[PDB]
Amino acid sequence: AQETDRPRFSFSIAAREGKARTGTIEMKRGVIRTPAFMPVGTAATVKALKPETVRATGADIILGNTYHLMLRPGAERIAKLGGLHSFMGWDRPILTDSGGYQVMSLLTKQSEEGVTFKSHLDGSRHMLSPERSIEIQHLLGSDIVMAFDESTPYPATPSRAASSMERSMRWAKRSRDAFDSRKEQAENAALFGIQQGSVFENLRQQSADALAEIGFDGYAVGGLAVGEGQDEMFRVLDFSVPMLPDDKPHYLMGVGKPDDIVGAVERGIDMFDSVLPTRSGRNGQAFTWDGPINIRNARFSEDLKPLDSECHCAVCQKWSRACIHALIRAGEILGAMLMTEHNIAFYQQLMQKIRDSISEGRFSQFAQDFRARYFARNS
Amino acid sequence: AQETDRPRFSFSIAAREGKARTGTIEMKRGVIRTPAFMPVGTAATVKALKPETVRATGADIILGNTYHLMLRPGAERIAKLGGLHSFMGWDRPILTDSGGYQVMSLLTKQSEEGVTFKSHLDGSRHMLSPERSIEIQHLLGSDIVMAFDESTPYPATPSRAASSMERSMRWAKRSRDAFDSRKEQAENAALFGIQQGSVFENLRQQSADALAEIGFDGYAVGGLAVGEGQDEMFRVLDFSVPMLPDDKPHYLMGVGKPDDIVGAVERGIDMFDSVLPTRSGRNGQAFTWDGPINIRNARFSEDLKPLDSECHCAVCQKWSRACIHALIRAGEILGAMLMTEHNIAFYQQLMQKIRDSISEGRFSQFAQDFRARYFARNS
Numbered sequence: 001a002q003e004t005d006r007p008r009f010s011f012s013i014a015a016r017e018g019k020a021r022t023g024t025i026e027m028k029r030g031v032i033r034t035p036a037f038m039p040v041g042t043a044a045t046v047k048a049l050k051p052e053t054v055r056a057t058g059a060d061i062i063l064g065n066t067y068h069l070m071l072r073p074g075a076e077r078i079a080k081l082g083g084l085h086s087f088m089g090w091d092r093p094i095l096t097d098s099g100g101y102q103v104m105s106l107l108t109k110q111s112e113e114g115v116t117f118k119s120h121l122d123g124s125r126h127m128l129s130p131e132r133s134i135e136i137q138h139l140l141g142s143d144i145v146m147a148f149d150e151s152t153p154y155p156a157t158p159s160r161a162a163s164s165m166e167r168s169m170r171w172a173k174r175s176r177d178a179f180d181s182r183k184e185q186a187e188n189a190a191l192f193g194i195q196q197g198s199v200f201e202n203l204r205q206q207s208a209d210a211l212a213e214i215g216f217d218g219y220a221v222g223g224l225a226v227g228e229g230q231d232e233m234f235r236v237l238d239f240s241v242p243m244l245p246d247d248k249p250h251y252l253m254g255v256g257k258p259d260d261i262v263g264a265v266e267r268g269i270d271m272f273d274s275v276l277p278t279r280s281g282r283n284g285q286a287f288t289w290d291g292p293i294n295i296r297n298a299r300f301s302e303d304l305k306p307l308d309s310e311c312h313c314a315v316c317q318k319w320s321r322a323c324i325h326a327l328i329r330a331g332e333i334l335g336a337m338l339m340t341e342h343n344i345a346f347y348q349q350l351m352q353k354i355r356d357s358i359s360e361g362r363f364s365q366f367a368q369d370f371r372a373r374y375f376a377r378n379s
Numbered sequence: 380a381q382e383t384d385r386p387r388f389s390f391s392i393a394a395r396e397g398k399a400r401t402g403t404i405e406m407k408r409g410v411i412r413t414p415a416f417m418p419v420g421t422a423a424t425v426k427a428l429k430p431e432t433v434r435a436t437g438a439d440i441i442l443g444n445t446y447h448l449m450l451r452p453g454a455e456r457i458a459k460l461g462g463l464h465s466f467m468g469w470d471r472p473i474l475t476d477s478g479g480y481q482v483m484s485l486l487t488k489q490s491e492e493g494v495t496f497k498s499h500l501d502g503s504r505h506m507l508s509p510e511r512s513i514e515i516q517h518l519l520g521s522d523i524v525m526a527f528d529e530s531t532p533y534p535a536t537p538s539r540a541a542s543s544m545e546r547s548m549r550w551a552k553r554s555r556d557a558f559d560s561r562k563e564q565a566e567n568a569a570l571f572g573i574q575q576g577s578v579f580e581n582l583r584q585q586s587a588d589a590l591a592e593i594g595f596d597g598y599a600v601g602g603l604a605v606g607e608g609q610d611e612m613f614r615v616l617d618f619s620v621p622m623l624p625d626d627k628p629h630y631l632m633g634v635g636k637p638d639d640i641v642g643a644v645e646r647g648i649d650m651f652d653s654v655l656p657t658r659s660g661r662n663g664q665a666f667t668w669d670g671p672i673n674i675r676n677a678r679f680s681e682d683l684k685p686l687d688s689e690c691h692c693a694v695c696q697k698w699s700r701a702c703i704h705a706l707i708r709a710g711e712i713l714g715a716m717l718m719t720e721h722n723i724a725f726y727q728q729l730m731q732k733i734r735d736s737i738s739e740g741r742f743s744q745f746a747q748d749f750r751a752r753y754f755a756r757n758s
């Protein structure tokens with residue numbers, strides 16, 4: 001297996017239960033077990049977890065934010081340093097987003113051509129387009145490349161949703177052709193397209209048909225987790241995911257809380273990313289099977305139990321709630337490091353329980369058991 | 380008081396009980412409460428406690444090791460950086476030793492002139508003598524200067540003890556004259572002489588007479604804590620301290636354990652220094668009123684009590700034995716920092732209880748109470 005050839009991108013489904021699937025994506029830099037959670041990476045420095053720590057939590061792939069990497073230190077500099085894998089100290093697969101969401105979310109010109117913007121960090125002028133985004137993701141050397149699309153706001157008028165979806169599909173074809181124009185990228189990386197259409201079923205169908213006609217290695221459901229509430233996100237997923245090709249991975253970008261993930265897998269999603277484990281860890285919040293906890297709470301000052309008494313992570317094998325409480329209350333960076341490591345490992349253990357329960361044909365029961373306990377909050 | 384003149388060196392005894400004294404040494408950089416414990420300083424870097432942390436433990440004065448400072452970064456470099464107070468970030472009094480003990484303890488030439496040695500750190504050649512030692516301590520800018528003497532080994536033949544004591548007294552006069560030759564040093568610093576004579580009463584008397592004839596600001600009892608055992612050290616102190624001038628401070632160099640300190644104050648010692656609080660802290664050992672403890676012991680893994688339940692230090696206000704146990708077992712530098720801070724603060728609280736009990740005329744009872752509990756070890 002270590003001495004055997006590695007494919008560019010091969011998705012295999014090993015077991016199904018309803019709309020949920022479990023399987024593997026094989027790529028040249030490693031195997032991704034699905035459903036998969038991708039932690040959001042940053043530069044390999046003393047301020048973040050070590051890459052070996054992130055791998056030991058169970059992560060098979062991480063996400064890079066193209067927009068931030070463009071602004072500092074820049075894509076040309078990362079390429080000169082050997083690419084994102086060398087820059088981040090991570091030798092397994094990396095998915096990069098297109099950079100387009102943070103352009104809107106965080107602007108000199110805007111048209112069907114693409115966008116121009118100035119950096120808040122130094123005032124430098126930057127440009128993004130389907131062609132430029134794919135080029136930058138090539139310079140970063142990422143393994144999964146996201147097509148460049150146009151985000152529709154929330155809430156969105158049906159006219160604005162139609163306009164952004166249609167532009168996104170023209171940009172999806174441009175993304176496809178730019179990716180295919182570069183032999184080194186097309187033979188070694190994969191390209192995902194992004195379905196849009198807001199909450200409107202007919203627009204989602206139009207979008208799915210357009211992406212399937214272009215053809216991609218995987219398909220993301222875009223335009224969700226932007227403030228719509230879980231009920232609505234689930235309702236959109238109910239009809240949107242069946243529209244995508246069944247035999248390719250389905251990616252829900254930027255989701256999310258543990259119960260978001262469970263419900264999305266019930267609806268056919270294979271891949272997830274979120275900053276939540278890290279943001280929560282830095283803020284003194286831990287995920288547990290009994291719901292999130294705020295470790296600063298007085299009730300934890302003498303609690304000798306680990307953050308979660310069923311969590312297998314390296315933190316919970318050693319550190320008590322009481323001592324992580326002490327570290328966080330003192331502002332010691334070790335406290336935030338430990339809670340971040342635990343939160344990412346908890347997410348990976350959630351994904352593993354999901355994969356195991358699908359394989360054993362008991363995922364619907366797992367999801368019900370999970371919700372009953374997570375929302376009772378007997379922590 | 381803040382707007383009033385400061386004397387070069389003024390020792391006042393406020394209260395006595397038997398041979399024990401409590402009082403103050405006023406100097407230009409601050410007041411030293413006696414009996415005093417001097418922590419042993421190092422360079423103000425990320426590897427040591429912050430100077431403000433050392434001050435907050437209660438220390439009024441710290442000790443600098445002239446030998447180590449000569450070898451790295453060198454006395455001329457420290458002077459160029461503004462002196463030891465600027466180098467160490469410590470603006471209160473500093474006592475420096477002469478460098479002579481580490482010459483023996485850690486050698487190109489040796490005679491009545493002085494010594495020449497090579498540095499293990501770089502092979503550089505270095506020279507020490509009464510004149511050179513005082514000159515180097517002037518470059519360091521220390522407030523209390525130790526005369527340069529010759530250490531007698533332990534055990535020592537009565538002939539070797541006589542020979543080293545007599546050479547030390549000739550060197551004490553040379554130290555006196557070198558110190559007095561430098562107006563800037565003589566007007567702003569103080570000079571201590573060192574009694575020698577090993578375990579032999581007549582040699583100790585000869586030494587005391589010689590030092591009193593020369594005249595010093597304070598008098599150290601040298602040649603102890605070099606392997607002789609507490610009973611013997613106490614026996615030597617019994618007759619040696621009364622030989623020194625009563626109205627000047629008495630300094631027992633390199634002592635020691637808490638029970639060494641208590642017994643030495645019972646015998647007339649006013650000043651102490653030891654690396655023990657730091658060495659123990661780095662090795663996971665804490666001093667307590669119930670004797671030392673090894674925090675790595677399994678019995679502490681769930682112990683929510685502080686290192687010492689009567690200690691007022693900043694560490695014991697916040698951190699449990701259980702969490703310091705966790706930090707030390709993990710090799711986190713914070714663990715060693717906390718135990719070092721607690722150990723130095725414990726030493727200062729020992730000195731404060733000694734001072735208060737002398738002032739109240741209950742020091743003999745304090746010493747008996749202290750020993751009964753420290754040696755019972757009901758920790």
Ligand SMILES: [Zn+2]
Nearest residue numbers: 311313316342
């Ligand atoms: Zn954990």
Ligand SMILES: [Zn+2]
Nearest residue numbers: 690692695721
């Ligand atoms: Zn303490």
